[PDB]
RNA sequence: AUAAACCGGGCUCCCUGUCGGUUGUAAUUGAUAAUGUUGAGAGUUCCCCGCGCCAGCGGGG
């Protein structure tokens, strides 16, 4: 009924953010909407000031994220976390001019042993088409990463392309099956939702608005 | 071009000094490896050269 694009986000370390104005940079357990929009953005070489392109992207695309557990030699490996005592010396003291602090400190959280399968699709008011997105994910223009730039991908961003009625149905065709799914679209049997502050307010730089995921447990 | 980007946790530091593991102790007694057997036959011994009366004879490997 609808055509989906299927991506895999997998690497030794990932980081998907939560509200902070502080030096500790938190992570949640799966990709944020903002972040996925950012990933696609990087693929479609969109500069940071290009509010038109950013808005087009945001209004065109929607995501569903599945949390894939890792299995090594027939054993399950749970997603764990990591805190990096991250230091900066010679950091700007102010936005104007060149005075700087001897040392500042930050704490940054990462996800270890995490892997995701993402399904994205187009909205009825789409400015784009899926062929574009596929081409981009296969040949990105800006460097693609998993949250932070220090976080490479260990598997091609492109997984596949297909067609179904649910996101759930779409994702069924792609191993590993069995993980939880967080979708921007409702799936009939399922009633639980999960609140986040993912949604980028493109008109207002680096500020995010509340939204809700639909949860499809496995 | 993702709470993103830009982005060291970083400098200094003997584990050091003393110390027998030592005295005593048969592995010891018994035990055929024994019966039986032509090495016969068969001139192939591979290469080069000389002489040949084509029976072979000789030189060198």
């Amino acid at each position: 009924m609808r055509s989906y694009l299927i991506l895999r986000l997998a690497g030794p370390m990932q980081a998907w953010g939560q509200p902070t104005f502080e030096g500790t940079r938190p992570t949640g357990r799966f990709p944020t909407r903002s972040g996925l929009l950012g990933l696609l953005g990087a693929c479609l070489g969109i500069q940071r000031d290009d509010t038109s392109s950013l808005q087009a992207l945001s209004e065109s695309v929607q995501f569903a994220v599945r949390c894939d557990e890792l299995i090594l030699d027939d054993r399950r490996v749970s997603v764990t976390g990591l805190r990096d005592y991250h230091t900066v010396l010679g950091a700007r003291e102010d936005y104007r001019g060149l005075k700087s602090h001897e040392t500042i400190q930050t704490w940054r959280e990462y996800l270890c042993d995490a892997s995701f399968t993402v399904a994205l699709w187009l909205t009825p008011h789409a400015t784009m088409v899926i062929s574009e997105l596929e081409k981009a994910v296969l040949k990105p223009r800006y460097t693609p990463y998993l949250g932070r730039r220090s976080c490479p991908l260990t598997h091609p961003l492109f997984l596949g392309t297909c067609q179904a009625s649910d996101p759930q149905k779409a994702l069924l065709n792609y191993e590993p099956v069995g993980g939880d799914i967080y979708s921007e679209e409702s799936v009939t049997g399922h009633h639980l939702k999960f609140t986040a502050r993912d949604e980028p307010m493109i008109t207002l730089p680096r500020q995010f608005a509340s939204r809700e995921w639909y949860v499809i447990k496995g």
Side-chain angles (χ1 to χ4, degrees), chain A residues 153-199:
Chain A
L153 286 79
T154 48
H155 176 286
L157 194 53
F158 176 75
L159 194 56
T161 166
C162 79
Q163 237 154 22
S165 70
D166 281 322
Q168 192 190 26
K169 308 289 182 78
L171 286 173
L172 206 177
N173 305 286
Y174 295 92
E175 275 296 315
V177 178
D180 289 335
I181 301 177
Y182 296 87
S183 177
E184 293 208 67
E185 178 190 315
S186 198
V187 181
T188 41
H190 313 282
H191 306 307
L192 302 65
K193 300 186 76 166
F194 174 87
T195 324
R197 199 175 267 275
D198 297 324
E199 189 71 64

Side-chain angles (χ1 to χ4, degrees), chain A residues 84-134 136-139:
Chain A
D84 191 41
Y85 180 69
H86 188 162
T87 260
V88 182
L89 49 84
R92 49 180 179 270
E93 159 168 348
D94 192 340
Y95 301 104
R96 314 253 321 252
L98 294 207
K99 21 182 52 162
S100 76
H101 291 107
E102 170 120 6
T103 319
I104 69 162
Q105 49 191 20
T106 67
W107 299 262
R108 317 207 193 174
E109 281 165 17
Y110 299 83
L111 289 178
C112 290
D113 282 326
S115 172
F116 303 94
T117 297
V118 180
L120 66 86
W121 64 98
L122 297 187
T123 33
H125 32 86
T127 316
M128 303 175 164
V129 300
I130 271 178
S131 325
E132 293 167 346
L133 297 181
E134 188 190 344
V137 160
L138 291 159
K139 295 193 176 200

Side-chain angles (χ1 to χ4, degrees), chain A residues 70-77:
Chain A
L70 164 66
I71 294 132
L72 276 184
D73 298 307
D74 282 324
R75 293 179 181 85
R76 293 185 184 275
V77 185

Side-chain angles (χ1 to χ4, degrees), chain A residues 47-103:
Chain A
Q47 293 167 328
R48 293 191 166 104
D49 63 335
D50 192 350
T51 43
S52 314
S53 305
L54 292 173
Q55 230 165 7
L57 188 45
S58 182
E59 317 179 326
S60 311
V61 194
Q62 280 182 317
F63 307 95
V65 178
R66 184 182 72 200
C67 315
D68 305 341
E69 208 173 36
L70 164 66
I71 294 132
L72 276 184
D73 298 307
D74 282 324
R75 293 179 181 85
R76 293 185 184 275
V77 185
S78 309
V79 164
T80 41
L82 165 52
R83 203 186 69 175
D84 191 41
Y85 180 69
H86 188 162
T87 260
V88 182
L89 49 84
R92 49 180 179 270
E93 159 168 348
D94 192 340
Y95 301 104
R96 314 253 321 252
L98 294 207
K99 21 182 52 162
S100 76
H101 291 107
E102 170 120 6
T103 319

